[PDB]
């Protein structure tokens, strides 16, 4: 709802199962570990998780940023509104299948439709890195290497607590192989643009479009899968911990993705989802910041 | 089922004395061809009076009587509205005004080249039809029939009948063979009385014969679908260091081709049909014609819902079924049935709805018991991150799927999978998958039988699937077989992934250019399904005969076939100057070949061949792109320049001399490779320079060589250079020592 | 004056545009220009175009003036190299080189005359 | 307290380097083995993986038998030491200006070499490319100073002060006893930002 906080990588890995593969962004639930697992060093947790559950504040995942927040393609939004040369309006359907994010100036003509041919932002290596004379050991590890102007910006709360933890982020890194040489950003809170918040709603109910991965509390779960266009994407992975010395397994979330569209926009979680008989708890933040769509 | 044996077999048999008045020429009415042989070959009457009075014309009032829902399916199988040419080709009336193409009717076989069509086949090729006919009546004399033997006949049409035209007497109806025009005809006429039986009516002759029109407008047709989604997630999960590489790849592949089988082949058996309404079946897509009624649409919505509990117990959302119906009246036939938005129209109807169900994927019941956790595992599955039911296959701890999946790749090489109750690697609801030996069919007990890459009949009465496969050696030998028999070849392998281009854009719309849209059948783009299933699935091993390579996988439109690089090379050569003889011209695909070194792993091999396939696809559509992203040529100047004419050239000099060595060949590279204004004068003084070095008996050799040579270097348009440079690449490794 | 995009092409031209030994029908449409001329003149050049690569352009000058010498001079023995510094403009180009850039141009433009000459007969 | 102090140094290269990576095609006459460069710019970079395994092998030879390597490095095992307190980042080749005042024609130099057998006595060539002598890349590496630490936070600093020592006194490359190697870590300063923690006696264990 408040203030877009543009972070510039210009090296990340970010996730999506596998190692040999870096998704371009990294969705409201790795950054809020990545808080979570930084307001432990601090020592200053329990300030936060206070806050953490609380209406006031929000939370965003990434977008790219070439001189203007984007945002992500809605879920089949876009209606069939022409049986025409179909030898390559289904060509058209090929490279329009693949984009995933349109610019913010532009988003209301995509509604009403409109090609956007795809720009490109941090086209992802694929490095063999290794590990000299072992038995089996040629990993690869993928790279997004950012085009030499694009952010991020989570949108969060304009909180002090979280501006202190989000500046030490910038040395700590987000993604992938950070001790390595990956995901070490330099952040710039900027401040957002006059109709983006104006439809950075909640709780509108109207048809509305998702910014961001959202678990539904269970009483909003029935009717939402009524009208909405989601993407499911399997939240999941092993568990950070510094206190098992073993590598266990989170509970498998499976999430909405952001993109998708829906109507009375519903109210999301903080999932637990702990392995059995485990010390502390695995947040994995899932509760939409909204976007409204003809409004 | 319980009675359609009269009705099935009678709307699939018809019209069989056609084929007998084709052979012997006989002056008889050809409805009553078939009746009488039916006679003396078997003895069921029932069936026998549909072929009695199939025609409906010459008797329409003998004897409530099956033969009246064979007219009407007759008619809407056929793509017009019902004098002796052969097959034309279907190519005749695809894309452009080109030159006609006829078949040569003959058979089909695991060891017969492709059957091209040319344009001297406008006579009657008479006398195979009698080896056509005494190859029927060999086998229908010994039959059953029932749905134990209800698709061994099936491929008695698909391989004898494949290329026998229907009604040449004609002017449209030219390219609608007669196994395909009995195969959509028999599809029609089972959801005819799927259609009528559950609306509740018994006569024939008042819904059917009066009111034809009517029935030409009302909407008694489905035509379903469905969308195995993500297939590449699956087969593409390979990675450096995965201990089974290629076996592993060339097992999902054929997993996921079966389970595509079994979605059709359980679908049937749950309805009362079979494999004559599955119009095509590819790679996770497939097209049916099923019956609109309530009866139906609810078994479809009941079993999409019981197989994606199937596949979500055994993958977890990284499969999932997409079904998609369509409701249609007798819309797809040429006669002037709203010619622009009717024919695909209702064809993307059933497409929209998959689209709706890819995008809104479950429900609430099924994603409340997805996250309910209470799962504290500690190793995962470490090829598809799966959690339930480790086991420890050779010190890895891999899931219960991909343990089966090495099981499968030991018995891939089998003739025969059955469908099994509880025997590993599941397809299905109650449905294992097993590879097996021939006669161990009496010992193991199954449900349904495949057998693959075959048209004996045999004893099991199976079901022919389709799967491109061939193995000339090892995978880890073809680097190793490159050399010649002097030992002149570098070490490499080289893998290839064809693709067609534009294929859907040609399947969906496809033959609308020619006429006013009067080729805008179901019938064309359902031969248009077989000839482009038929070449990749089954001739591609004829292509790769003794090439010394695998084809890991050949479905729909994608090769990819891994191998020696001398032969690889070669094979997409030699498969595209045969795939655009049997298209003429159209359909161009596109191909991109890697060398890699021996060793190497499959993952890193498949990947960057993908990379070299995507940019050939941009080039503009059509080209291939060897080794490199960089040499993206065009199909129609690598094979007439590059691998025929400047090759050969190349290698008439570099033999009839012993002087210029490879020393001369490789400081041409670079300044071919360079290539500013300054090399074409460095290039003019190397080449002069040797003129008079050289022994001065084979100076014109030299000297016609090097005024060749510099023609193409100077020529300032590019695409006359870069093939010098491949072509020189092309034959150092083929003298790599 | 020659550009970086045409001192081939004008060097090309040159040789043609030089004359040739158009009596004595003994392999004829020779030139009068041989070949032990044109490469005396490309040894002065061919020491340059090394040396300027390797060192600064600052210490070259001293024989880049010594070229206008020995250019002048073998023109001045022999009248068919005499008719080569009019032709291809090479007392008009040896006055413009100011810089390592140039250098490196004209004496790729003296390797061009020596191709083509090596080419055309 | 907490803080994140940082050692900003500039690299150079006394010999080339040769990180490579992914290979691609040979292509004849092409590169028998690319260095591994940024994708964007097309400019040579080292990796900090390649920074950061190869001066923890160094200090394994010197504090061996562990304890104080895998507290600055990490460990799979051992909870007390996952994400261990050393986030390193990749070099950019910050004068990518200089060199060319210096006056240079491209960044990496492409080196010829062989390999001769010993009884055939016929070459085997190669063309290893290298990034060329003198080079400056961004060198920099945030210490991490935790609740937990500031009791051991000197006896890292004698560590990682020992641990860039070593590579001026090794290679940091590929192909390095053939040279390739040579680096030296000059302007070794250890600024801090986002915490509260005086860096001014370890500057002077720097010099
Ligand atoms: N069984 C198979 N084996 C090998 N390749 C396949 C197979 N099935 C599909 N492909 C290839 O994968 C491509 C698309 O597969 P995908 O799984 O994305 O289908 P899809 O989910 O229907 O795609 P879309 O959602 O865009 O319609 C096709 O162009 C085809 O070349
Ligand atoms: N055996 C087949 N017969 C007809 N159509 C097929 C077959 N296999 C796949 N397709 C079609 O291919 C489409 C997916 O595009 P695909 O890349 O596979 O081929 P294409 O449409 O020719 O596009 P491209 O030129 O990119 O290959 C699907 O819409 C599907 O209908
Ligand atoms: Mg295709
Ligand atoms: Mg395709
Ligand atoms: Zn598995």
Redesign the pocket.
């Known amino acids: 709802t408040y203030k877009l906080y543009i972070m510039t990588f210009q090296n990340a890995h970010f996730g999506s199962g596998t190692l040999d593969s870096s998704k371009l962004t990294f969705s409201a639930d790795r950054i809020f570990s990545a808080l979570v697992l930084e307001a432990l060093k601090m020592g200053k947790l329990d300030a936060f998780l206070a806050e953490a559950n609380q209406d006031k504040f929000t939370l965003t995942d990434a977008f790219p940023f070439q001189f203007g927040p984007f945002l992500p393609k809605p879920i089949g939004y876009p209606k069939h509104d022409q049986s025409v040369d179909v030898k390559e309006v289904?060509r058209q359907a090929?490279l329009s299948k693949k984009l995933q994010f349109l610019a913010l100036e532009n988003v209301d003509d995509y509604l009403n439709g409109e090609l956007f041919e795809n720009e490109e932002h941090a086209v992802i290596d694929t490095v063999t890195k290794n590990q000299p004379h072992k038995d089996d050991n040629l990993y690869q590890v993928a790279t997004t290497r950012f085009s030499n102007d694009t952010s991020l910006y989570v949108i969060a709360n304009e909180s002090d607590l979280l501006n202190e933890l989000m500046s030490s982020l910038q040395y700590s890194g987000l993604g992938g192989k950070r001790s390595s040489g990956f995901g070490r950003f330099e952040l710039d809170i900027q401040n957002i643009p006059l109709e983006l918040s104006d439809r950075l709603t909640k709780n509108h109910s109207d048809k509305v479009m998702s910014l961001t991965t959202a678990l539904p509390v269970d009483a909003d779960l029935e009717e939402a899968m009524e009208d909405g266009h989601y993407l499911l994407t399997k939240s999941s992975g092993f568990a950070f911990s510094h206190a098992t010395n073993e590598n266990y397994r989170k509970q498998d979330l499976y999430k909405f993705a952001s993109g998708s569209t829906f109507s009375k926009t519903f109210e999301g979680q903080i999932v637990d989802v702990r392995p059995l008989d485990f010390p502390h708890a695995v947040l994995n933040y899932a509760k939409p910041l909204f976007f409204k769509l003809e409004v | 089922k319980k009675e359609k044996i009269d009705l099935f077999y009678g709307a699939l048999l018809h019209n069989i004395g056609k084929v007998i008045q084709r052979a012997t020429g006989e002056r008889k009415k050809h409805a009553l061809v078939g009746a009488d042989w039916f006679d003396e070959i078997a003895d069921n009457q029932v069936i026998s009076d549909q072929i009695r009075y199939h025609m409906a014309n010459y008797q329409s009032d003998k004897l409530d009587h099956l033969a009246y829902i064979t007219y009407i399916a007759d008619n809407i199988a056929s793509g017009v509205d019902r004098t002796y040419t052969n097959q034309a080709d279907i190519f005749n009336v695809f894309g452009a005004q080109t030159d006609k193409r006829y078949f040569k009717p003959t058979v089909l076989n695991l060891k017969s080249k492709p059957n091209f069509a040319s344009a001297t086949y406008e006579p009657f090729s008479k006398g195979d039809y009698a080896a056509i006919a005494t190859r029927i009546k060999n086998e229908l004399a010994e039959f059953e029939f029932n749905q134990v033997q209800i698709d061994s006949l099936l491929n008695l049409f698909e391989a004898t009948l494949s290329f026998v035209p229907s009604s040449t007497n004609t002017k449209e109806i030219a390219d609608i063979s007669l196994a395909d025009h009995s195969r959509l005809t028999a599809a029609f006429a089972l959801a005819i009385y799927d259609y009528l039986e559950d609306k509740g009516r018994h006569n024939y002759k008042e819904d059917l014969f009066t009111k034809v029109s009517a029935f030409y407008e009302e909407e008694a047709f489905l035509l379903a679908s469905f969308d195995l989604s993500g297939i590449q997630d699956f087969i593409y999960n390979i990675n450096i260091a995965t201990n089974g590489a290629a076996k592993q790849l060339k097992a999902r592949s054929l997993y996921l081709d079966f389970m595509s089988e079994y979605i059709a082949d359980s679908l049937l058996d749950k309805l009362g049909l079979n494999r004559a309404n599955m119009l095509?079946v590819?790679?996770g897509?497939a097209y049916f014609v099923l019956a609109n009624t309530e009866k139906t649409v609810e078994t479809l919505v009941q079993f999409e819902k019981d197989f994606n509990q199937f596949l979500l117990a055994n993958f977890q959302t990284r499969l999932y079924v997409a079904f998609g119906w369509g409701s249609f009246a007798a819309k797809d036939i040429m006669s002037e049935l709203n010619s622009p938005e009717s024919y695909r129209q209702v064809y993307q109807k059933a497409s929209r709805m998959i689209s709706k169900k890819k995008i809104s994927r479950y429900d609430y019941q099924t994603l409340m018991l997805l996250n309910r956790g209470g799962k504290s595992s500690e190793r995962e599955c470490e090829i598809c991150h799966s959690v339930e039911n480790l086991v420890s296959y050779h010190d890895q701890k891999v899931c219960d799927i991909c343990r089966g999946l090495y099981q499968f790749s030991k018995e891939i090489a089998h003739d025969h999978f059955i469908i099994t109750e509880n025997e590993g690697l599941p397809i299905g609801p109650n449905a294992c998958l097993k590879g097996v030996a021939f006669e161990k069919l009496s010992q193991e007990a199954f449900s349904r039988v495949y057998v693959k890459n075959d048209y004996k009949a045999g004893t099991v009465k199976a079901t022919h699937v389709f799967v491109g496969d061939y193995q000339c050696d090892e995978i880890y030998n073809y680097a190793a077989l490159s050399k010649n028999e002097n030992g002149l070849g570098i070490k490499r392998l080289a893998v290839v992934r064809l693709?067609?281009?534009?294929?859907?854009?040609?399947?969906?719309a496809g033959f609308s250019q020619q006429g006013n849209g009067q080729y805008s059948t179901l019938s064309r783009s359902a031969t248009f399904?077989r000839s482009?299933?038929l070449f990749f699935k089954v001739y591609i091993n004829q292509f790769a005969s003794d090439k010394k390579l695998s084809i890991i996988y050949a479905g729909?439109?994608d090769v990819f076939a891994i191998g020696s690089w001398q032969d690889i090379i070669a094979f997409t050569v030699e498969l595209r100057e045969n795939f655009i003889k049997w298209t003429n011209g159209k359909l161009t695909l596109s191909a991109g070949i890697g060398l890699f070194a021996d060793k190497t792993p499959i993952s890193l091999m498949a990947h960057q061949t993908g990379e070299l396939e995507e940019a050939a696809?941009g080039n503009e559509?059509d080209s291939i792109s060897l080794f490199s992203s960089d040499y993206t040529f065009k199909f129609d100047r690598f094979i007439t320049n590059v691998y025929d004419d400047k090759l050969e050239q190349i290698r008439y000099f570099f033999n009839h001399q012993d002087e210029r060595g490879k020393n001369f060949i490789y400081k041409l590279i670079e300044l071919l490779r360079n290539h500013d204004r300054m090399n074409m004068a460095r290039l003019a003084y190397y080449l002069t320079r040797l003129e008079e070095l050289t022994r001065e008996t084979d100076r014109d050799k030299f000297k016609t060589f090097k005024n060749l040579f510099y023609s193409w270097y100077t020529n300032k348009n590019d695409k006359d250079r870069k093939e010098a440079e491949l072509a020189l690449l092309l034959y150092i490794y083929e003298i790599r020592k | 004056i020659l550009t970086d995009e045409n001192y081939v092409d004008i060097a090309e031209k040159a040789i043609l545009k030089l004359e040739r030994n158009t009596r004595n029908r003994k392999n004829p449409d020779a030139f009068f220009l041989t070949t032990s001329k044109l490469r005396n003149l490309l040894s002065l050049t061919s020491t340059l175009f090394d040396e300027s690569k390797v060192k600064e352009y600052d210490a070259l000058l001293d024989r880049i003036a010594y070229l206008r010498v020995q250019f002048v001079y073998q023109a001045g023995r022999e009248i068919a190299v005499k008719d080569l510094i009019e032709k291809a403009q090479i007392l008009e180009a040896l006055k413009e080189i100011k810089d390592r850039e140039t250098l490196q141009r004209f004496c790729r433009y003296m390797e061009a005359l020596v191709a083509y000459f090596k080419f055309y007969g | 307290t907490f803080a994140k102090i940082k050692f900003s140094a500039q690299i150079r290269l006394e010999t080339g380097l040769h990180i490579g990576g992914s290979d691609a095609f040979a292509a004849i006459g092409a590169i028998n083995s690319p260095v591994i460069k940024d994708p964007i710019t097309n400019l040579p970079i080292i990796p900090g993986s390649s920074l950061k395994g190869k001066m923890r092998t160094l200090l394994a030879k010197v504090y061996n038998e562990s304890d104080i390597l895998s507290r600055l490095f990490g460990n799979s095992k051992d909870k007390r030491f996952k994400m261990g307190r050393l986030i390193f980042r990749d070099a950019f080749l910050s004068n990518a200006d200089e060199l060319d005042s210096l006056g240079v024609r491209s960044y990496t130099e492409v080196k010829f070499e062989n390999t001769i057998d010993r009884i055939t006595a016929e070459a085997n060539p190669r063309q290893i490319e290298r990034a060329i002598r003198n080079s400056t890349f961004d060198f920099e590496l945030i210490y991490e100073i935790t609740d937990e630490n500031e009791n051991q936070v000197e006896e890292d600093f004698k560590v990682i002060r020992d641990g860039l020592k070593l590579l001026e006194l090794d290679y940091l490359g590929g192909s390095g006893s053939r040279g390739y190697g040579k680096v030296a870590f000059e302007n070794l300063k250890a600024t801090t930002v986002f915490g509260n923690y005086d860096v001014k006696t370890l500057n002077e264990l720097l010099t």
């Not at chain 2, 693709?499 to 969906?508: E, I, K, N, R, S």
């Open positions: 289904r090929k | 095509y590819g790679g897509h693709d067609v281009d534009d294929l859907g854009a040609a399947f969906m399904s482009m299933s729909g439109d696809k559509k």
